[PDB]
Amino acid sequence: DIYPEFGTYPGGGESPIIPFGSEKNAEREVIHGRWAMLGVTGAWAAENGTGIPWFTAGTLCTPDDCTAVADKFPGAVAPLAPEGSGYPSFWNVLIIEIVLVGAAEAYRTGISDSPFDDGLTVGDVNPGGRFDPLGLAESGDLEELKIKELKHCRLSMFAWLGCIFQALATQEGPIANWQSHVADPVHSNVLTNAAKGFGFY
Amino acid sequence: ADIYPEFGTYPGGGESPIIPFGSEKNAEREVIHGRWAMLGVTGAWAAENGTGIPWFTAGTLCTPDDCTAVADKFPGAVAPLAPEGSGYPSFWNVLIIEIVLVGAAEAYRTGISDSPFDDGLTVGDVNPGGRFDPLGLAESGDLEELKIKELKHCRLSMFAWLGCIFQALATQEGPIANWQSHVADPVHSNVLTNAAKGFGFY
Amino acid sequence: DIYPEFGTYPGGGESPIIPFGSEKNAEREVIHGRWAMLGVTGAWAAENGTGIPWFTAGTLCTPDDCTAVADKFPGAVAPLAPEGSGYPSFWNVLIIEIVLVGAAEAYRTGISDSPFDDGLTVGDVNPGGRFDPLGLAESGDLEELKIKELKHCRLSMFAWLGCIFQALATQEGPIANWQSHVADPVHSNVLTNAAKGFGFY
Amino acid sequence: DIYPEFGTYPGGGESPIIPFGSEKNAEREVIHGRWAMLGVTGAWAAENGTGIPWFTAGTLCTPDDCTAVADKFPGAVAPLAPYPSFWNVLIIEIVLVGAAEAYRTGISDSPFDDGLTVGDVNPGGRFDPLGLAESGDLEELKIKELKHCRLSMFAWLGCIFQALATQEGPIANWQSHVADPVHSNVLTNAAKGFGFY
Numbered sequence: 148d149i150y151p152e153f154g155t156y157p158g159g160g161e162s163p164i165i166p167f168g169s170e171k172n173a174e175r176e177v178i179h180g181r182w183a184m185l186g187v188t189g190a191w192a193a194e195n196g197t198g199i200p201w202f203t204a205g206t207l208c209t210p211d212d213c214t215a216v217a218d219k220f221p222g223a224v225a226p227l228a229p230e231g232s233g234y235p236s237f238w239n240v241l242i243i244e245i246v247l248v249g250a251a252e253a254y255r256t257g258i259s260d261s262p263f264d265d266g267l268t269v270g271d272v273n274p275g276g277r278f279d280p281l282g283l284a285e286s287g288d289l290e291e292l293k294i295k296e297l298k299h300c301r302l303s304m305f306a307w308l309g310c311i312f313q314a315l316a317t318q319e320g321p322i323a324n325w326q327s328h329v330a331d332p333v334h335s336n337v338l339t340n341a342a343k344g345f346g347f348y
Numbered sequence: 349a350d351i352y353p354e355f356g357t358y359p360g361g362g363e364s365p366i367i368p369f370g371s372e373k374n375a376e377r378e379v380i381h382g383r384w385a386m387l388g389v390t391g392a393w394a395a396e397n398g399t400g401i402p403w404f405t406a407g408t409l410c411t412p413d414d415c416t417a418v419a420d421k422f423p424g425a426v427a428p429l430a431p432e433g434s435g436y437p438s439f440w441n442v443l444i445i446e447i448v449l450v451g452a453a454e455a456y457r458t459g460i461s462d463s464p465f466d467d468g469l470t471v472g473d474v475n476p477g478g479r480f481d482p483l484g485l486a487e488s489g490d491l492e493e494l495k496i497k498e499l500k501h502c503r504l505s506m507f508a509w510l511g512c513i514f515q516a517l518a519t520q521e522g523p524i525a526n527w528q529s530h531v532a533d534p535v536h537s538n539v540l541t542n543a544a545k546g547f548g549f550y
Numbered sequence: 551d552i553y554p555e556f557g558t559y560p561g562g563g564e565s566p567i568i569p570f571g572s573e574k575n576a577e578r579e580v581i582h583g584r585w586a587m588l589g590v591t592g593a594w595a596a597e598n599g600t601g602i603p604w605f606t607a608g609t610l611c612t613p614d615d616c617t618a619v620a621d622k623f624p625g626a627v628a629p630l631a632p633e634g635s636g637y638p639s640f641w642n643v644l645i646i647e648i649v650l651v652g653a654a655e656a657y658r659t660g661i662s663d664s665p666f667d668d669g670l671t672v673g674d675v676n677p678g679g680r681f682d683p684l685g686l687a688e689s690g691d692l693e694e695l696k697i698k699e700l701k702h703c704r705l706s707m708f709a710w711l712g713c714i715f716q717a718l719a720t721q722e723g724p725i726a727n728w729q730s731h732v733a734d735p736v737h738s739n740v741l742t743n744a745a746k747g748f749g750f751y
Numbered sequence: 752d753i754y755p756e757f758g759t760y761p762g763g764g765e766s767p768i769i770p771f772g773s774e775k776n777a778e779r780e781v782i783h784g785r786w787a788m789l790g791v792t793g794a795w796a797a798e799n800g801t802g803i804p805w806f807t808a809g810t811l812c813t814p815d816d817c818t819a820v821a822d823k824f825p826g827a828v829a830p831l832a833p834y835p836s837f838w839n840v841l842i843i844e845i846v847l848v849g850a851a852e853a854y855r856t857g858i859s860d861s862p863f864d865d866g867l868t869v870g871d872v873n874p875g876g877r878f879d880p881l882g883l884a885e886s887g888d889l890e891e892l893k894i895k896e897l898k899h900c901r902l903s904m905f906a907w908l909g910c911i912f913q914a915l916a917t918q919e920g921p922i923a924n925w926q927s928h929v930a931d932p933v934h935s936n937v938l939t940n941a942a943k944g945f946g947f948y
């Protein structure tokens with residue numbers, strides 16, 4: 148069987164708990180899943196390569212002294228911008244991000260006409276043609292690849308929700324919590340931290 | 349639509365992408381919730397401009413034991429609210445009058461209690477159009493357009509009240525105080541710098 | 551004029567605030583209510599009998615030590631544990647609890663075939679084929695008595711939600727809070743607690 | 752998919768390794784495993800109740816006397832001893848077990864004669880008192896018992912093996928393994944050399 152975990156994909160079946168009234172939700176959760184996938188991975192990798200929590204990473208790059216993020220990346224012996232130049236600038240990064248992500252979102256969602264000329268209908272979260280340089284979808288199964296991605300989508304969104312509530316409970320960070328739970332499983336869990344009071348009680 | 353350009357839409361204008369419109373009672377609830385929110389956000393706006401007390405702390409000034417503090421709080425007042433010598437707006441006094449007046453108005457708004465007026469005023473209609481609009485602004489103005497204006501103000505003010513309650517929970521400083529801090533230096537005074545400070549808990 | 555209150559029962563009428571959802575919700579609210587009945591009664595009785603909150607009561611039986619719960623039951627002729635060996639140890643109780651409850655839930659919902667084969671159908675709101683040994687309510691106005699328990703379900707669920715929320719607010723316990731209210735409501739209240747700050751502000 | 756594990760069940764399909772042509776060993780696997788499941792189960796139960804290993808539990812009893820078990824059981828309302836003597840329990844054990852064997856294999860007459868053929872490993876006519884044999888389909892339930900039978904025979908083999916390597920006891924080996932699985936296993940005990948090297 149395909150998708151036998153719990154419930155069924157939006158493409159086929161009905162939610163056990165929700166009515167699934169609106170068909171905008173399907174692609175919404177695809178996009179949300181993909182973003183979460185990149186977010187969870189980011190939180191996984193940053194705290195490994197740098198040791199900082201993902202939720203306090205924002206404090207390193209601020210409109211004054213954004214140079215803290217420079218050279219934080221593993222390997223990458225050259226910093227983001229040279230030391231002493233002070234060019235890692237929150238506003239410069241923010242403007243570059245605003246223009247790039249805003250243009251990408253406008254192209255995806257039809258706020259602006261697509262720059263390309265080859266199909267790419269607005270609102271489809273599986274474009275394929277331009278977004279498969281390797282040609283893995285035509286070689287593989289399209290439907291089961293889409294199901295795998297969905298499983299990853301929902302798994303990563305649930306992992307992100309876990310990351311934020313772990314951040315709120317323990318105030319430490321995802322990987323450090325994972326390592327504490329691995330080291331002493333009985334003595335590092337949610338009920339253990341509840342016995343400590345979650346840091347406020 | 350042409351008239352409603354906001355992200356969402358008005359009930360009857362169409363259907364919302366998220367949580368589409370169900371029962372009409374939901375639309376009545378939205379309008380009334382808006383109306384009370386407009387009143388609430390305006391009160392939280394004007395009171396601490398007049399005297400500086402955040403709305404989430406203004407409750408405790410009046411207490412069953414002592415309620416003198418609420419008297420003479422309104423700026424510009426010619427005299428005390430009740431005798432200067434012995435202010436008599438006691439919390440119980442306030443309650444006993446207000447529960448009766450508000451309960452009456454509510455039951456008479458919804459018609460669970462027989463209407464006093466019986467002027468053709470039909471309960472369960474957000475726009476009574478009777479004595480409530482003596483100016484009859486709706487009669488001169490265009491009623492569809494004006495309904496859209498009312499709902500836009502409803503949603504804006506309900507969102508503003510949500511902002512007021514969450515700002516109270518994060519910064520516990522006060523709405524206009526948060527405004528003045530942000531206008532003072534928005535770059536270094538906003539939600540994310542308060543997050544860096546930790547919202548007062550972390 | 552049965553159920554002449556704010557709302558209506560799932561069988562007749564429609565939900566005033568929330569969309570009625572599905573039949574799955576209609577069967578599920580009752581089960582949540584039965585569990586909330588048991589939970590609220592357990593919190594009430596454990597606190598009257600022991601004096602320590604239901605929430606903190608989870609720290610009494612830890613993997614390292616479960617002997618604290620040995621002599622907590624009021625009016626017990628002897629402690630359940632021998633007091634001297636600490637035989638519970640949280641592991642026997644955990645394992646037998648998970649097997650018994652998991653089996654019971656599996657048989658309730660037909661995850662596994664029912665063993666009685668007494669004609670009972672899985673997923674029924676009120677099976678009653680062997681869940682009414684006394685028969686006092688089976689014979690005579692069954693529909694009304696379902697309304698009775700329905701009203702108790704919604705109450706116990708609301709009471710549990712209030713229990714968890716004011717546990718969060720005050721961190722003292724439900725009936726400690728109830729005694730504080732009853733002794734002098736006017737100076738010991740939710741709004742008084744908010745003005746002083748529940749545990750914060 | 753009934754029994755997707757490696758191999759096949761004796762009733763159908765030739766084994767993947769050891770060919771055979773005798774139904775006697777097909778009978779014998781299931782009885783050897785049943786005896787194992789009782790042995791391995793008692794391994795935990797005893798070792799957890801008394802806190803001693805099963806192989807020293809054997810020599811806990813002496814020919815001269817067997818009083819160590821008195822009040823050794825967990826939660827015993829009264830100790831089994833008030834004659835805590837080995838031979839007293841031995842003659843009764845060997846007689847009861849011997850009779851059971853004779854009755855199950857056909858050396859002596861069956862006491863019930865309820866149609867239980869000694870050749871049959873599944874005389875459910877008098878056995879399965881709950882009646883799960885007829886409550887559910889018998890074939891799958893044969894497989895379930897067999898799987899457990901093989902599981903517990905391998906667990907007994909491994910139990911006795913660990914007994915010989917570490918002598919610390921199966922569940923004590925379990926606790927040591929789950930405590931630090933990286934540096935507590937067969938290969939780190941072989942790095943110590945099982946005590947003999």
Ligand code: CLA
Nearest residue numbers: 356357358359362363364367368369374375377378381506
């Ligand atoms: C209590 C207030 C309230 C009520 C009853 C409604 C009701 C309605 N709105 Mg309106 N709306 C509100 C507030 C409200 N809205 C606000 C504040 C905004 C601005 C963000 C809007 C913006 C809006 C748009 C843009 C649209 C609607 C639409 C609708 C209809 C869709 C069905 C629905 O969502 O109902 C259920 C009612 C809800 C309020 C949804 C629940 C929201 C959840 C619970 C999140 C809220 C979190 C909460 C504030 C947490 C507080 C915690 C704090 C106390 C600590 C219905 C008539 C749609 C419509 O009519 O389309 C034809 C539509 O297009 N509304």
Ligand SMILES: CC1=C[C@H](O)CC(C)(C)[C@H]1/C=C/C(C)=C/C=C/C(C)=C/C=C/C=C(C)/C=C/C=C(\C)CCC1=C(C)C[C@H](O)CC1(C)C
Nearest residue numbers: 162163164165179182183186189190201202204304307308
């Ligand atoms: C990497 C990085 C580094 C920096 O340090 C900081 C940083 C923040 C920038 C960060 C960047 C992160 C990013 C870009 C993240 C993007 C995240 C996103 C899109 C998250 C979405 C999260 C979604 C959630 C929770 C869903 C909850 C919904 C649930 C359970 C309902 C489930 C439900 C339904 C629907 C149907 C069933 O039948 C029944 C049930 C009830 C089960």
